[PDB]
Amino acid sequence: LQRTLVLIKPDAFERSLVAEIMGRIEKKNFKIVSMKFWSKAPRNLIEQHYKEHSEQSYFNDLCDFMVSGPIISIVYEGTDAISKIRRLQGNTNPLASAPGTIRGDLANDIGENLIHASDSEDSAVDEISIWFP
Amino acid sequence: LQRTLVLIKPDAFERSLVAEIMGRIEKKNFKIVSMKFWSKAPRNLIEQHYKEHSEQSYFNDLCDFMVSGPIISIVYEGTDAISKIRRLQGNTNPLASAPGTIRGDLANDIGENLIHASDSEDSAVDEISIWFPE
Amino acid sequence: LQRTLVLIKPDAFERSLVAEIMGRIEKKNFKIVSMKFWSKAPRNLIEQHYKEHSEQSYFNDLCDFMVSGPIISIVYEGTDAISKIRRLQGNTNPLASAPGTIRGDLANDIGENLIHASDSEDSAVDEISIWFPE
Amino acid sequence: LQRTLVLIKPDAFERSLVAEIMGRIEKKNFKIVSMKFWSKAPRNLIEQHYKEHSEQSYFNDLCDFMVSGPIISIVYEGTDAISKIRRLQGNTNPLASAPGTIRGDLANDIGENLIHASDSEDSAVDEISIWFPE
Amino acid sequence: LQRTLVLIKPDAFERSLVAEIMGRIEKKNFKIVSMKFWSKAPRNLIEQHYKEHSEQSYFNDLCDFMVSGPIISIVYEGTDAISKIRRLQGNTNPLASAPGTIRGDLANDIGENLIHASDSEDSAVDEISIWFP
Amino acid sequence: LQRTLVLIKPDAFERSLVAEIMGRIEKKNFKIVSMKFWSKAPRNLIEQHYKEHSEQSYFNDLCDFMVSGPIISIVYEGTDAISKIRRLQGNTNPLASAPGTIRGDLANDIGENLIHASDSEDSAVDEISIWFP
Ligand SMILES: Nc1nc2c(ncn2[C@H]2C[C@H](O)[C@@H](COP(=O)(O)OP(=O)(O)O)O2)c(=O)[nH]1
Ligand SMILES: Nc1nc2c(ncn2[C@H]2C[C@H](O)[C@@H](COP(=O)(O)OP(=O)(O)O)O2)c(=O)[nH]1
Ligand SMILES: Nc1nc2c(ncn2[C@H]2C[C@H](O)[C@@H](COP(=O)(O)OP(=O)(O)O)O2)c(=O)[nH]1
Ligand SMILES: Nc1nc2c(ncn2[C@H]2C[C@H](O)[C@@H](COP(=O)(O)OP(=O)(O)O)O2)c(=O)[nH]1
Ligand SMILES: Nc1nc2c(ncn2[C@H]2C[C@H](O)[C@@H](COP(=O)(O)OP(=O)(O)O)O2)c(=O)[nH]1
Ligand SMILES: Nc1nc2c(ncn2[C@H]2C[C@H](O)[C@@H](COP(=O)(O)OP(=O)(O)O)O2)c(=O)[nH]1
Ligand SMILES: [Mg+2]
Ligand SMILES: [Mg+2]
Ligand SMILES: [Mg+2]
Ligand SMILES: [Mg+2]
Ligand SMILES: [Mg+2]
Ligand SMILES: [Mg+2]
């Protein structure tokens, strides 16, 4: 049993895909244990969330996008939730994400990619602490 | 432009219908203004929400059901959102709710009926204040 | 609590709509009590099922259609299942069946109308005995 | 057997609902006879299509909206296709369109209402001649 | 042209996924040629069905689960039905089943995995004989 | 940004899958820039479209199938549309097409395979010129 942190990104709101994305996770039998709606996430939480990318060329654009609309932060619980939801999510690169995955079916950009999911036990604990202190 | 209060009820969680219900409202182009997840809503909140039903025979059973699992409280915004979301919701009674509505397609019980939606401007203001006192 | 008899008709098989129809009933929380698949139902069974239509002009065409492909006979159980599944089914006439109903969304003919559902407690008992004599 | 003229309106493209709408008609077993994609329909065509509305206050806004993005014009064929597709379409007014209909499920505005469908045999002939003069 | 034996497992009934599963197979153009509903399958048919697993640690739990609710046994027919429906089914292990497969999208447990499908020509003939003697 | 040529094949019309197929592409955020409905495509356009296959054993059957019902020709536009829509399409061979792809989920024959999509920049330009001269 694990908990993982998911963000529904602003593009999902723009494209009316919030329920589509949450529903794929729900259908896999993962349970919501915490959830918050952000009309606009604070810049600082975004920058901490993506702190590992702070020196990357895309950092400012990434942060700007992430505050360009609402987000939902969700903690999901289930056996091996971290790796399983990562598999549902699909590759960051739209040249690679597989049909059947969230990004494979729905995302068409490396940045506007609909969903964040924690990538490891340690990052899940960190991200949960950021969004649900 | 109106705001209405929606509750996703514990049966929606039990039956894995949360996204199905939220998706129906989303597809109609209503926007989420506020949203809160409750692992278990306090009974007092439920009693306030349903204060008008306090003398009904089902009142205690209703409150028990509403604290039996999680709830999501959502404020939706849109033109005439109150009446429109009520029409999407469907009638309380499973003998009446129309196919095409949330309850008509998905609910089979008068109590376990998946979704609350404010029924008037007055009650919306009241219910939003209960679930989102801030 | 009631039991009703449903037939998935040969047009549902031809149009690959079997799961679509069954899924609508499943999503409403009705439970399967008995189910039988018929590669081709015996004409006598069809004539008994529709005995009340024996003097109608369409009777032979109706029987021909019903043996033209497979049928699934299902007994569903639930509170007020008979009237509820009738409302999900929709009116026989394509000029009347409502969007949101099975026939309203999917059927375009008065005869090739995808689904049978018992219309009363009396007929349910009768039809269940025809399809599930055991 | 009838033919009716359907327009998929620019809001359907903006909201990525083209296939959703076309799919509802397809699932009802109507057949496409002719179809044209317009990156932007000429304003004159729109004015002719809606000539009966020329004195209405919304006429210019309606024409502006109709040229604001792509349109697909489709001729559908089927028994009583005109009235049937009108029932699937749903009422113009978001306070009235029924859950289960295209507009009832998906449209939230009196103007941005996703779909046109001919309302009579006379208007179908007229509209088909506008969009498919050949 | 082949026939294969599918079981819709009790978890599909519990989670109201019977039509979802049958529909994926139907949409692939496979045809039902036989079908039976079991309110509760006889223990002995289950034990014969899974006879190869009789000495495995999970055997008793597997059999208990399989009689814990209804099942549907279905014979499907189509060109290369056996391998094709196996591909639709997805890996037994939820760490491996691919998004887009039945188990990949819907199952979250190695045991409660929604669907059985014959794995070979010989096992299909055997399983069909068990469920449709 | 690229344009690619898609054909919705006659089997999609027969099986009422036109919107299902177009919808998968629409949900991936590709935009229609040209589209024509053919009640019956001219034999010569089909033979030119598939000119590379003219000496293959299946050529006549392929062409006969392609004129056996309506088709829709569509030009889709988007970043890397050619490879992305090819990935959505899935392998020609039903023993290989992956669940989650159009063919993987819906097609059950090597010939009756629902959809054509250009396989390269050069073939896209050629096919667009055939269907939209
Ligand atoms: N424009 C651009 N954005 C990028 C690139 N790599 C990552 N990003 C953005 C989008 C990602 O969702 C986010 C975090 O990157 P990540 O942890 O490697 O990706 P992921 O866990 O969201 O799949 O940063 C990139 O190469 N280009
Ligand atoms: N068991 C039972 N419960 C009832 C009955 N009427 C109402 N309830 C419960 C379920 C309703 O969702 C809740 C509030 O009643 P309401 O305001 O008349 O209905 P609604 O706005 O949820 O459609 O009380 C009733 O007659 N029997
Ligand atoms: N061609 C034709 N067939 C008809 C007509 N009325 C009924 N039928 C056929 C189709 C019906 O499913 C079947 C039984 O008629 P019913 O009991 O009045 O309708 P229903 O309970 O299936 O809605 O007989 C009719 O008017 N014309
Ligand atoms: N803003 C506005 N637009 C309107 C109103 N009534 C009609 N329209 C626009 C939207 C309609 O799709 C179009 C044609 O009107 P119609 O023939 O009465 O409606 P309909 O056949 O599209 O349902 O004109 C109206 O009252 N207000
Ligand atoms: N708990 C548990 N159950 C298992 C394990 N391996 C197999 N099973 C159960 C679930 C399988 O559906 C069933 C038959 O095993 P199988 O033939 O290797 O799997 P499959 O053909 O259902 O994918 O036995 C296992 O390793 N642990
Ligand atoms: N019967 C048969 N038909 C074939 C075979 N290979 C190709 N075809 C037909 C179906 C294909 O959609 C069409 C073009 O072949 P292709 O370019 O290798 O396939 P694809 O780009 O449609 O996946 O020719 C084949 O091996 N057998
Ligand atoms: Mg990451
Ligand atoms: Mg109320
Ligand atoms: Mg009747
Ligand atoms: Mg009109
Ligand atoms: Mg096996
Ligand atoms: Mg090719």
PDB file of N, CA and C in Angstrom, chain A residues 67-107:
ATOM      1  N   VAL A  67       0.832  27.914 -13.512  1.00  0.00           N
ATOM      2  CA  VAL A  67      -0.006  28.909 -12.837  1.00  0.00           C
ATOM      3  C   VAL A  67      -0.980  29.603 -13.798  1.00  0.00           C
ATOM      4  N   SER A  68      -1.098  29.081 -15.018  1.00  0.00           N
ATOM      5  CA  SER A  68      -1.925  29.695 -16.063  1.00  0.00           C
ATOM      6  C   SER A  68      -3.407  29.340 -15.970  1.00  0.00           C
ATOM      7  N   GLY A  69      -3.729  28.425 -15.070  1.00  0.00           N
ATOM      8  CA  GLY A  69      -5.095  27.977 -14.867  1.00  0.00           C
ATOM      9  C   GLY A  69      -5.163  27.175 -13.585  1.00  0.00           C
ATOM     10  N   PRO A  70      -6.334  26.611 -13.285  1.00  0.00           N
ATOM     11  CA  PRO A  70      -6.459  25.822 -12.061  1.00  0.00           C
ATOM     12  C   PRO A  70      -5.642  24.543 -12.093  1.00  0.00           C
ATOM     13  N   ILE A  71      -5.366  24.009 -10.911  1.00  0.00           N
ATOM     14  CA  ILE A  71      -4.883  22.647 -10.787  1.00  0.00           C
ATOM     15  C   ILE A  71      -5.632  21.957  -9.663  1.00  0.00           C
ATOM     16  N   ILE A  72      -5.665  20.633  -9.728  1.00  0.00           N
ATOM     17  CA  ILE A  72      -6.110  19.842  -8.598  1.00  0.00           C
ATOM     18  C   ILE A  72      -4.952  18.999  -8.101  1.00  0.00           C
ATOM     19  N   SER A  73      -4.694  19.047  -6.798  1.00  0.00           N
ATOM     20  CA  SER A  73      -3.700  18.151  -6.218  1.00  0.00           C
ATOM     21  C   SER A  73      -4.423  17.020  -5.507  1.00  0.00           C
ATOM     22  N   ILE A  74      -4.024  15.787  -5.799  1.00  0.00           N
ATOM     23  CA  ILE A  74      -4.728  14.628  -5.261  1.00  0.00           C
ATOM     24  C   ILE A  74      -3.726  13.631  -4.718  1.00  0.00           C
ATOM     25  N   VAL A  75      -4.016  13.089  -3.540  1.00  0.00           N
ATOM     26  CA  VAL A  75      -3.240  11.962  -3.047  1.00  0.00           C
ATOM     27  C   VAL A  75      -4.063  10.711  -3.281  1.00  0.00           C
ATOM     28  N   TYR A  76      -3.493   9.764  -4.024  1.00  0.00           N
ATOM     29  CA  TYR A  76      -4.152   8.499  -4.318  1.00  0.00           C
ATOM     30  C   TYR A  76      -3.480   7.402  -3.529  1.00  0.00           C
ATOM     31  N   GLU A  77      -4.267   6.427  -3.089  1.00  0.00           N
ATOM     32  CA  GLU A  77      -3.756   5.322  -2.298  1.00  0.00           C
ATOM     33  C   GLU A  77      -4.115   3.999  -2.939  1.00  0.00           C
ATOM     34  N   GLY A  78      -3.169   3.068  -2.919  1.00  0.00           N
ATOM     35  CA  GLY A  78      -3.411   1.723  -3.409  1.00  0.00           C
ATOM     36  C   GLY A  78      -2.116   0.942  -3.441  1.00  0.00           C
ATOM     37  N   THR A  79      -2.220  -0.372  -3.600  1.00  0.00           N
ATOM     38  CA  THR A  79      -1.028  -1.190  -3.689  1.00  0.00           C
ATOM     39  C   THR A  79      -0.181  -0.745  -4.890  1.00  0.00           C
ATOM     40  N   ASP A  80       1.081  -0.410  -4.625  1.00  0.00           N
ATOM     41  CA  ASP A  80       2.006   0.046  -5.662  1.00  0.00           C
ATOM     42  C   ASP A  80       1.451   1.198  -6.508  1.00  0.00           C
ATOM     43  N   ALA A  81       0.731   2.107  -5.855  1.00  0.00           N
ATOM     44  CA  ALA A  81       0.121   3.246  -6.545  1.00  0.00           C
ATOM     45  C   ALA A  81       1.130   4.079  -7.330  1.00  0.00           C
ATOM     46  N   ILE A  82       2.336   4.240  -6.793  1.00  0.00           N
ATOM     47  CA  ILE A  82       3.307   5.110  -7.453  1.00  0.00           C
ATOM     48  C   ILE A  82       3.662   4.622  -8.859  1.00  0.00           C
ATOM     49  N   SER A  83       4.146   3.391  -8.980  1.00  0.00           N
ATOM     50  CA  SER A  83       4.532   2.891 -10.300  1.00  0.00           C
ATOM     51  C   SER A  83       3.326   2.665 -11.219  1.00  0.00           C
ATOM     52  N   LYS A  84       2.212   2.225 -10.645  1.00  0.00           N
ATOM     53  CA  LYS A  84       1.033   1.934 -11.461  1.00  0.00           C
ATOM     54  C   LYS A  84       0.461   3.201 -12.093  1.00  0.00           C
ATOM     55  N   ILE A  85       0.364   4.270 -11.317  1.00  0.00           N
ATOM     56  CA  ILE A  85      -0.157   5.513 -11.876  1.00  0.00           C
ATOM     57  C   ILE A  85       0.833   6.159 -12.840  1.00  0.00           C
ATOM     58  N   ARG A  86       2.131   6.003 -12.581  1.00  0.00           N
ATOM     59  CA  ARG A  86       3.124   6.414 -13.572  1.00  0.00           C
ATOM     60  C   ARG A  86       2.929   5.697 -14.913  1.00  0.00           C
ATOM     61  N   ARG A  87       2.605   4.410 -14.860  1.00  0.00           N
ATOM     62  CA  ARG A  87       2.383   3.651 -16.086  1.00  0.00           C
ATOM     63  C   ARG A  87       1.131   4.153 -16.817  1.00  0.00           C
ATOM     64  N   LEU A  88       0.081   4.462 -16.059  1.00  0.00           N
ATOM     65  CA  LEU A  88      -1.138   5.033 -16.643  1.00  0.00           C
ATOM     66  C   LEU A  88      -0.859   6.381 -17.298  1.00  0.00           C
ATOM     67  N   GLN A  89       0.012   7.168 -16.673  1.00  0.00           N
ATOM     68  CA  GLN A  89       0.320   8.525 -17.125  1.00  0.00           C
ATOM     69  C   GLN A  89       0.918   8.563 -18.532  1.00  0.00           C
ATOM     70  N   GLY A  90       1.950   7.751 -18.746  1.00  0.00           N
ATOM     71  CA  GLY A  90       2.616   7.724 -20.034  1.00  0.00           C
ATOM     72  C   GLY A  90       3.814   8.659 -20.096  1.00  0.00           C
ATOM     73  N   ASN A  91       4.652   8.419 -21.096  1.00  0.00           N
ATOM     74  CA  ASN A  91       5.897   9.151 -21.279  1.00  0.00           C
ATOM     75  C   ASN A  91       5.672  10.651 -21.472  1.00  0.00           C
ATOM     76  N   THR A  92       6.614  11.453 -20.986  1.00  0.00           N
ATOM     77  CA  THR A  92       6.525  12.907 -21.118  1.00  0.00           C
ATOM     78  C   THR A  92       6.492  13.337 -22.583  1.00  0.00           C
ATOM     79  N   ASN A  93       7.253  12.622 -23.409  1.00  0.00           N
ATOM     80  CA  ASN A  93       7.439  12.981 -24.809  1.00  0.00           C
ATOM     81  C   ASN A  93       6.341  12.389 -25.678  1.00  0.00           C
ATOM     82  N   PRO A  94       5.600  13.250 -26.391  1.00  0.00           N
ATOM     83  CA  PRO A  94       4.454  12.776 -27.175  1.00  0.00           C
ATOM     84  C   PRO A  94       4.871  11.891 -28.348  1.00  0.00           C
ATOM     85  N   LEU A  95       6.168  11.824 -28.637  1.00  0.00           N
ATOM     86  CA  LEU A  95       6.652  10.886 -29.637  1.00  0.00           C
ATOM     87  C   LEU A  95       6.782   9.485 -29.058  1.00  0.00           C
ATOM     88  N   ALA A  96       6.649   9.374 -27.739  1.00  0.00           N
ATOM     89  CA  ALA A  96       6.898   8.110 -27.046  1.00  0.00           C
ATOM     90  C   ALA A  96       5.704   7.578 -26.257  1.00  0.00           C
ATOM     91  N   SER A  97       4.812   8.452 -25.797  1.00  0.00           N
ATOM     92  CA  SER A  97       3.739   7.970 -24.933  1.00  0.00           C
ATOM     93  C   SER A  97       2.822   7.011 -25.684  1.00  0.00           C
ATOM     94  N   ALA A  98       2.503   5.889 -25.043  1.00  0.00           N
ATOM     95  CA  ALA A  98       1.811   4.806 -25.733  1.00  0.00           C
ATOM     96  C   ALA A  98       0.306   5.013 -25.772  1.00  0.00           C
ATOM     97  N   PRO A  99      -0.332   4.688 -26.910  1.00  0.00           N
ATOM     98  CA  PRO A  99      -1.798   4.684 -26.893  1.00  0.00           C
ATOM     99  C   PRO A  99      -2.304   3.815 -25.750  1.00  0.00           C
ATOM    100  N   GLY A 100      -3.340   4.294 -25.070  1.00  0.00           N
ATOM    101  CA  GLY A 100      -3.869   3.600 -23.912  1.00  0.00           C
ATOM    102  C   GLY A 100      -3.480   4.317 -22.630  1.00  0.00           C
ATOM    103  N   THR A 101      -2.368   5.049 -22.663  1.00  0.00           N
ATOM    104  CA  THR A 101      -1.992   5.883 -21.528  1.00  0.00           C
ATOM    105  C   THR A 101      -2.707   7.228 -21.615  1.00  0.00           C
ATOM    106  N   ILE A 102      -2.741   7.953 -20.499  1.00  0.00           N
ATOM    107  CA  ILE A 102      -3.373   9.268 -20.464  1.00  0.00           C
ATOM    108  C   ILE A 102      -2.718  10.195 -21.488  1.00  0.00           C
ATOM    109  N   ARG A 103      -1.402  10.304 -21.420  1.00  0.00           N
ATOM    110  CA  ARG A 103      -0.707  11.171 -22.347  1.00  0.00           C
ATOM    111  C   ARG A 103      -0.724  10.619 -23.771  1.00  0.00           C
ATOM    112  N   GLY A 104      -0.637   9.297 -23.901  1.00  0.00           N
ATOM    113  CA  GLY A 104      -0.665   8.677 -25.217  1.00  0.00           C
ATOM    114  C   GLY A 104      -1.961   8.935 -25.969  1.00  0.00           C
ATOM    115  N   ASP A 105      -3.072   8.931 -25.243  1.00  0.00           N
ATOM    116  CA  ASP A 105      -4.378   9.135 -25.856  1.00  0.00           C
ATOM    117  C   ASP A 105      -4.720  10.615 -25.992  1.00  0.00           C
ATOM    118  N   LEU A 106      -4.248  11.438 -25.056  1.00  0.00           N
ATOM    119  CA  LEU A 106      -4.826  12.768 -24.906  1.00  0.00           C
ATOM    120  C   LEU A 106      -3.877  13.954 -25.016  1.00  0.00           C
ATOM    121  N   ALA A 107      -2.591  13.738 -24.771  1.00  0.00           N
ATOM    122  CA  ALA A 107      -1.647  14.857 -24.736  1.00  0.00           C
ATOM    123  C   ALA A 107      -0.890  14.953 -26.051  1.00  0.00           C
TER     124      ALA A 107
END
